[PDB]
Scaffold this active site. Structure first.
Site, PDB file in Angstrom:
ATOM      1  N   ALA A  30      42.250  38.171  42.691  1.00  0.00           N
ATOM      2  CA  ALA A  30      43.297  39.085  42.254  1.00  0.00           C
ATOM      3  C   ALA A  30      43.076  40.475  42.827  1.00  0.00           C
ATOM      4  O   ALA A  30      44.009  41.106  43.331  1.00  0.00           O
ATOM      5  CB  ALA A  30      43.340  39.136  40.729  1.00  0.00           C
TER       6      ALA A  30
ATOM      7  N   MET B  78      49.275  38.303  41.331  1.00  0.00           N
ATOM      8  CA  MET B  78      50.141  38.706  40.232  1.00  0.00           C
ATOM      9  C   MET B  78      50.555  40.165  40.359  1.00  0.00           C
ATOM     10  O   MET B  78      49.716  41.043  40.584  1.00  0.00           O
ATOM     11  CB  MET B  78      49.438  38.491  38.893  1.00  0.00           C
ATOM     12  CG  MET B  78      48.703  37.177  38.774  1.00  0.00           C
ATOM     13  SD  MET B  78      47.139  37.333  37.906  1.00  0.00           S
ATOM     14  CE  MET B  78      45.999  37.349  39.273  1.00  0.00           C
TER      15      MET B  78
ATOM     16  N   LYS C 147      43.779  40.433  46.623  1.00  0.00           N
ATOM     17  CA  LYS C 147      45.219  40.460  46.846  1.00  0.00           C
ATOM     18  C   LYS C 147      45.807  41.827  46.521  1.00  0.00           C
ATOM     19  O   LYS C 147      46.750  42.268  47.185  1.00  0.00           O
ATOM     20  CB  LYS C 147      45.906  39.377  46.014  1.00  0.00           C
ATOM     21  CG  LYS C 147      45.492  37.958  46.359  1.00  0.00           C
ATOM     22  CD  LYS C 147      45.924  37.556  47.752  1.00  0.00           C
ATOM     23  CE  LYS C 147      45.511  36.127  48.051  1.00  0.00           C
ATOM     24  NZ  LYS C 147      45.989  35.671  49.382  1.00  0.00           N
ATOM     25  N   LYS C 148      45.271  42.504  45.507  1.00  0.00           N
ATOM     26  CA  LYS C 148      45.701  43.851  45.161  1.00  0.00           C
ATOM     27  C   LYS C 148      45.191  44.901  46.137  1.00  0.00           C
ATOM     28  O   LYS C 148      45.600  46.061  46.041  1.00  0.00           O
ATOM     29  CB  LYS C 148      45.252  44.201  43.741  1.00  0.00           C
ATOM     30  CG  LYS C 148      45.995  43.432  42.668  1.00  0.00           C
ATOM     31  CD  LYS C 148      45.571  43.852  41.278  1.00  0.00           C
ATOM     32  CE  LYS C 148      46.164  42.925  40.236  1.00  0.00           C
ATOM     33  NZ  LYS C 148      47.602  42.649  40.493  1.00  0.00           N
ATOM     34  N   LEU C 149      44.308  44.531  47.060  1.00  0.00           N
ATOM     35  CA  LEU C 149      43.990  45.399  48.187  1.00  0.00           C
ATOM     36  C   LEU C 149      45.163  45.557  49.145  1.00  0.00           C
ATOM     37  O   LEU C 149      45.019  46.225  50.174  1.00  0.00           O
ATOM     38  CB  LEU C 149      42.772  44.865  48.944  1.00  0.00           C
ATOM     39  CG  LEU C 149      41.413  45.071  48.275  1.00  0.00           C
ATOM     40  CD1 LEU C 149      40.315  44.432  49.099  1.00  0.00           C
ATOM     41  CD2 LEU C 149      41.137  46.550  48.070  1.00  0.00           C
TER      42      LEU C 149
END
Ligand SMILES: CCCCCCCCCCCCCCCCCC(=O)O[C@H](COC(=O)CCCCCCCCCCCCCCC)COP(=O)(O)OCC[N+](C)(C)C
Ligand SMILES: CCCCCCCCCCCCCCCCCC(=O)O[C@H](COC(=O)CCCCCCCCCCCCCCC)COP(=O)(O)OCC[N+](C)(C)C
Ligand SMILES: *[C@@H]1O[C@H](CO)[C@@H](O[C@@H]2O[C@H](CO)[C@@H](O[C@@H]3O[C@H](CO)[C@@H](O)[C@H](O)[C@@H]3O)[C@H](O)[C@H]2NC(C)=O)[C@H](O)[C@H]1NC(C)=O
Ligand SMILES: CC(C)=CCC/C(C)=C/CC/C(C)=C/CC/C(C)=C\CC1=C(C)C(=O)c2ccccc2C1=O
Ligand SMILES: *[C@@H]1O[C@H](CO)[C@@H](O[C@@H]2O[C@H](CO)[C@@H](O)[C@H](O)[C@H]2NC(C)=O)[C@H](O)[C@H]1NC(C)=O
Ligand SMILES: *[C@@H]1O[C@H](CO)[C@@H](O[C@@H]2O[C@H](CO)[C@@H](O)[C@H](O)[C@H]2NC(C)=O)[C@H](O)[C@H]1NC(C)=O
Ligand SMILES: CC(C)CCC[C@@H](C)[C@H]1CC[C@H]2[C@@H]3CC=C4C[C@@H](O)CC[C@]4(C)[C@H]3CC[C@]12C
Lengths: 32, 665
Positions: free
Chosen positions: B183, B365, B186-188
């Site tokens: 998560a 997400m 991906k949020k990078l």
């Protein structure tokens, strides 16, 4: 309501039904 | 050694297969595994009537309904409605057995198979938390989670307070870490790091404390985005290590409580809250039971030390058996697959679209938010040749097909098979969908010139008719916001980026008086279809547009052009002026009066909603949940009776259905 006329189908500036911020993660209540 | 006290194992335990299997099947306390098993089963028991759709099966899988469904495999079809209710009943029974540890292996299978059948039945219902529920069920199927606080221990020995292999906790902790870390990775993404993914989330009252010190713009970046990214990246490490476990537990619990009160993500937050103490000592529930401040340990599970179990390898030789080797291999392969699947989009390029892969299994997400402006489903009858237009999402129960070439292909195939019923045979169906991801220019995601029905989509080939996301226009977004800030309360703007050779045919409704198009970048030829007049625009040129008439904006630049529509909705503006006149008349004291009455009623209802005391809103919430669960149970009973005892008379079916939908209070 299956078909749309030329005018209503080409109404891009028409306001969407609601403020669109879909995240694809929050469950859509009553999606059915 | 130091790593032994820090990692829970020694390096010598990874020397060979024998040592690794002995380590992974090390006897651990079953208490934490059992508590997580109970919590997961309880949360799935509650989730089945709410998110899975047991309370809406009759509205979703109604027999005779002409609906475009989106299974992962087109050969996978839903059962009749009664059999779907039976499948959900089996899922509920399996979740209950998982919660109580009753026939634990059988219950795990009885929840796992129906759950994954339902999951693969519709790609539009996929969430990261739903995929997480499926993963946790799949793991817990192979785990000895019935070795504590279970009816399996009350019914037969050798499972009552018995040791469990360490790899059960290893796999559960590894899955939770993988969720957190992937998560964070991906949020990078630039949208999350720069604050574009959720810049309106900080407006929530839950962020009021930070607003004391940070600004609203700074709270959304530092707390929501940087704080959330940092939490996701460091959560697994904080939870794993003992010295930081307390602070990690506090931070993770705060994160999940806020996410529970910020998003409608079902039981996601509660599932992760339950999974957080998995990183604690496996005997933490045993410690709590042993404490017994009220001396209630008689009702609580056994507090004695766990008994030896054949599932674990005890150092003494006692070479591991086949089940231990399978457990270690499952741990390794499952964790490798869980690390690889979020990044396997280089293999399945048929699901890439703008954001790589199907949504649900990449732990991405709330990273990509999409705002769709318009959807035009054109069709051309193959026999007549007449051009017609369809209501967007006419036969779909979801709207995710607008963002995926796989789901668009499925939708077009379903439309091509359904439209002959509506007099349109051999439909050539084109989709013109305008999507803006993370407040970018609205642009077409798919080619509007290609017949998806006959277009080529493959699971492992990049889709040729997916329009590339114009990332080179991402720096424009800030300026876009400035324009959005410069407008009044009666003016709206739509920012559109169009590809060369493509034109936007737009009908400006007669209500939208005082509409204009300003060219931001490139060149566009605006054609007054009604007046057949072509006007070429230069960057920064504003052209007034006729209301109630068509106009076609052709992108004539060699590079994608950017423009904006500035429209006022002057019918609503005049309505507001007339409403103000009526309000002044009332202060001094047909259809306009009706509109004023409707507005007054809406204002009164809005005021009353806030006036409701917190105990009244909570009691309304409890009544709504009770109604949902009761309707789920009653429709389930109706369909189960229809399956075993047969369908009764149509009148009696109507009476039972109207009893099921009756509100409890
Ligand atoms: C050579 C040929 C033979 C070997 C080939 C394979 C080589 C090794 C492959 C990887 C094997 C990893 C097995 C890990 C098993 C394991 O330790 O289980 C778990 C760890 O399982 C996990 O997957 C860890 C959860 C995620 C942690 C992420 C941060 C830390 C990563 C490094 C440690 C792992 C530990 O259980 P425990 O009860 O011993 O608690 C220890 C932690 N403290 C003491 C702080 C509470
Ligand atoms: C200790 C170690 C473990 C640590 C972690 C422990 C916690 C893990 C989870 C434990 C269980 C938690 C239960 C959570 C329940 C739950 O999900 O709450 C709710 C769901 O609540 C339920 O499912 C509970 C209702 C069950 C069915 C009805 C039961 C009876 C209702 C009360 C009686 C009514 C009538 C009374 C007589 C007149 C979330 O609902 P939602 O998705 O609509 O979210 C609302 C909020 N928004 C919309 C903002 C998102
Ligand atoms: C431009 O502004 C006008 C406002 O005058 C918008 O028209 C109005 O839209 C609302 C809903 O947004 C209509 O209210 C509802 O209409 C539906 C369909 O008839 C029905 O459920 C109720 O009758 C309800 O009142 C309203 O009737 C409609 N017209 C007026 C005169 O208010 C129009 O949508 C705006 N244009 C754009 C592109 O946003
Ligand atoms: C920078 C700083 C001062 C930090 C200290 C103090 C701060 C401000 C602490 C941290 C509280 C914040 C403010 C935490 C995150 C808000 C987040 C909004 C969103 C993203 C997100 C959502 C919505 C989910 O549902 C979800 C589910 C499962 C796994 C991951 C996620 C996930 O990632
Ligand atoms: C059509 O709408 C635009 C935008 O709502 C109006 O533009 C405004 O013009 C006034 C004139 O001084 C400026 O003060 C505002 O800042 C403008 N608003 C903007 C740029 O958003 C325009 O006047 C309207 N046309 C008519 C005929 O009413
Ligand atoms: C206005 O200009 C546009 C392009 O600048 C014209 O669109 C082209 O029309 C011809 C027909 O003569 C087609 O063959 C081309 O394919 C069109 N170009 C496209 C679609 O990119 C349009 O016809 C012009 N209209 C008027 C009234 O002058
Ligand atoms: C009628 C059919 C669909 C129902 C039978 C259930 C089968 C197909 C289910 C049960 C367990 C499921 C697996 C459980 C876990 C994983 C790991 C995940 O990272 C990818 C999906 C995958 C590999 C699932 C694939 C589908 C699966 C094998």
């Amino acid at each position: 309501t299956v078909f749309l006329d030329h005018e209503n189908a080409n109404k891009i500036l028409n306001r969407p039904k609601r403020y669109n911020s879909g995240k694809l993660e929050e469950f859509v209540q009553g999606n059915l | 050694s130091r790593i032994g006290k820090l990692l829970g194992f020694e390096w010598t335990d990874l020397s060979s297969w024998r040592r690794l299997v002995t380590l992974l099947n090390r006897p651990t306390d079953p208490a934490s595994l059992a508590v997580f098993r109970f919590l997961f089963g309880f949360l799935m028991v509650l989730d089945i009537p709410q998110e899975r759709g047991l309370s809406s099966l009759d509205r979703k899988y109604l027999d005779g309904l002409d609906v475009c469904r989106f299974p992962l495999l087109d050969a996978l079809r839903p059962l009749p409605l009664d059999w779907m209710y039976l499948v959900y009943t089996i899922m509920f029974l399996g979740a209950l057995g998982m919660m109580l540890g009753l026939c634990y292996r059988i219950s795990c299978v009885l929840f796992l198979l129906p759950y994954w059948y339902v999951f693969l039945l519709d790609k539009t219902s996929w969430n990261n938390h739903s995929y997480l529920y499926g993963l946790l069920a799949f793991q817990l199927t192979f785990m000895d989670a019935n070795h504590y606080w279970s009816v399996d221990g009350l019914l037969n020995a050798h499972r009552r307070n018995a040791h469990v292999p360490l790899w059960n906790y290893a796999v559960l902790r590894g899955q939770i870490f993988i969720v957190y870390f992937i998560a964070g990775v991906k949020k990078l993404d630039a949208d999350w790091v720069e604050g574009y993914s959720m810049e309106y989330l900080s407006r929530h009252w839950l962020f009021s404390p930070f607003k004391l010190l940070l600004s609203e713009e700074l709270t959304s970046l530092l707390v929501v985005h940087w704080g959330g990214l940092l939490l996701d990246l460091s959560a697994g490490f904080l939870l794993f290590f003992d010295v930081s476990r307390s602070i990690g537990l506090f931070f993770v619990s705060y994160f999940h409580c806020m996410n529970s009160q910020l998003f409608s993500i079902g039981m996601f937050s509660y599932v992760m809250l339950a999974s957080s103490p998995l990183f604690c000592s496996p005997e933490w529930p045993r410690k709590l039971v042993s404490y017994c401040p009220r001396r209630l340990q008689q009702l609580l599970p056994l507090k004695a030390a766990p008994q030896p179990s054949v599932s674990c390898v005890y150092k003494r030789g006692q070479k591991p058996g086949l089940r231990h080797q399978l457990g270690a291999a499952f741990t390794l392969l499952y964790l490798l697959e869980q690390l690889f699947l979020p990044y396997s989009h280089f293999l399945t390029q048929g699901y890439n679209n703008w954001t790589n892969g199907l949504y649900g299994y990449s732990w991405d997400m709330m990273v990509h938010s999409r705002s769709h402006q318009h959807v035009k489903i054109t069709y051309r009858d193959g026999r007549t040749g007449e051009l017609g237009y369809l209501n967007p999402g006419v036969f779909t129960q979801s709207r995710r097909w607008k963002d995926h070439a796989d789901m668009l292909k499925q939708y077009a195939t379903c439309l091509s098979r359904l439209l002959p019923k509506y007099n349109v045979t051999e439909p050539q169906i084109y989709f013109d969908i305008w999507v803006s991801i993370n407040d970018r220019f609205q642009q077409r995601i798919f080619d509007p010139r290609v017949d998806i029905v006959q277009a080529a989509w493959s699971p492992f080939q990049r889709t040729s008719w997916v329009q590339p996301l114009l990332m080179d226009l991402s720096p424009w977004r800030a300026k876009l916001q400035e324009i959005k800030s410069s407008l009044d309360n009666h003016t709206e703007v739509v920012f559109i980026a169009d590809f060369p050779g493509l034109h936007l045919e737009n009908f400006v409704s007669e209500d939208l008086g005082n509409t204009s198009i300003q060219l931001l970048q490139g060149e566009v030829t605006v054609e007054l279809v009604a007046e057949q007049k072509n006007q070429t625009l230069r960057e920064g040129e504003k052209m007034q547009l006729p209301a109630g008439e068509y106009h076609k904006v052709y992108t004539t630049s060699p590079s994608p052009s950017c423009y904006m529509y500035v429209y006022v909705n002057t019918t609503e503006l005049a309505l507001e002026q007339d409403l103000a006149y009526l309000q002044e008349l009332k202060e001094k004291v047909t259809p306009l009066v009706q509109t004023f009455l409707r507005r007054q009623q809406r204002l009164q209802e809005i005021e009353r909603r806030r006036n409701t005391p917190f105990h009244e809103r909570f009691f309304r919430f409890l009544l709504r949940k009770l109604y949902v669960f009761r309707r789920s149970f009653l429709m389930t009973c109706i369909s189960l009776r229809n399956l075993i005892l047969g369908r009764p008379s149509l009148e009696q079916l109507a009476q039972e259905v109207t009893y099921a939908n009756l509100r409890p209070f």
